Design a protein around this ligand. Structure first.
Ligand code: NA
Ligand code: NA
Length: 161
């Protein structure tokens, strides 16, 4: 019931992995389209590729962590503290909300540029989203890395049985 509870809360990680694959390329494309129009917008759009790639690099690790929680022992669950579970839930929820904001901005920038409108607010929003995603994907990455290492060490120390 704990695993079915957290899994419901976090949702499909594969869905996030796929959507970030789509969006990282959409924004690399945008970065090439505007290289000679807005240096500033091109730079932030290019930044999004590596920012989103960090989640994909860690995707197998995140799925593995969820599986470990699914098959957890009484000793393993102590590593899954309430603080850590809350951090997992809140960073994944943050990713989903940020993606909701990020998705329409590529076309919005294309539309603004066509009608010669100011790109300032779009660039500011893209910078804010990039920084937020960097923070949350990095927190998720570190959380998963630490927990998996702790689980491995606990199992290694149980090997004597
Ligand atoms: Na596309
Ligand atoms: Na968090």
């Amino acid at each position: 019931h704990l695993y079915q509870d957290l899994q419901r809360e976090v949702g499909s990680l594969k869905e996030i992995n796929f959507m970030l694959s789509v969006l990282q390329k959409e924004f690399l494309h945008l970065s090439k389209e505007f290289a000679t129009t807005s240096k500033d917008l091109s730079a932030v759009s290019q930044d999004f590729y590596s920012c989103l790639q960090a989640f994909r690099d860690n995707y197998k690790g995140f799925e593995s962590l969820l599986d470990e929680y699914k098959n957890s022992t009484e000793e393993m669950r102590k590593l899954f503290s309430q603080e850590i579970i809350a951090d997992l839930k809140g960073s994944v929820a943050s990713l989903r909300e940020e993606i909701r904001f990020l998705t329409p901005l590529a076309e919005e920038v294309r539309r603004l540029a066509h009608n010669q409108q100011s790109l300032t607010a779009a660039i500011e929003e893209l910078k804010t989203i990039r920084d937020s995603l960097r923070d949350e994907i990095g927190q998720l990455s570190q959380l998963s890395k630490t927990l998996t290492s702790q689980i491995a060490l606990q199992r290694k120390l149980e090997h004597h049985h």
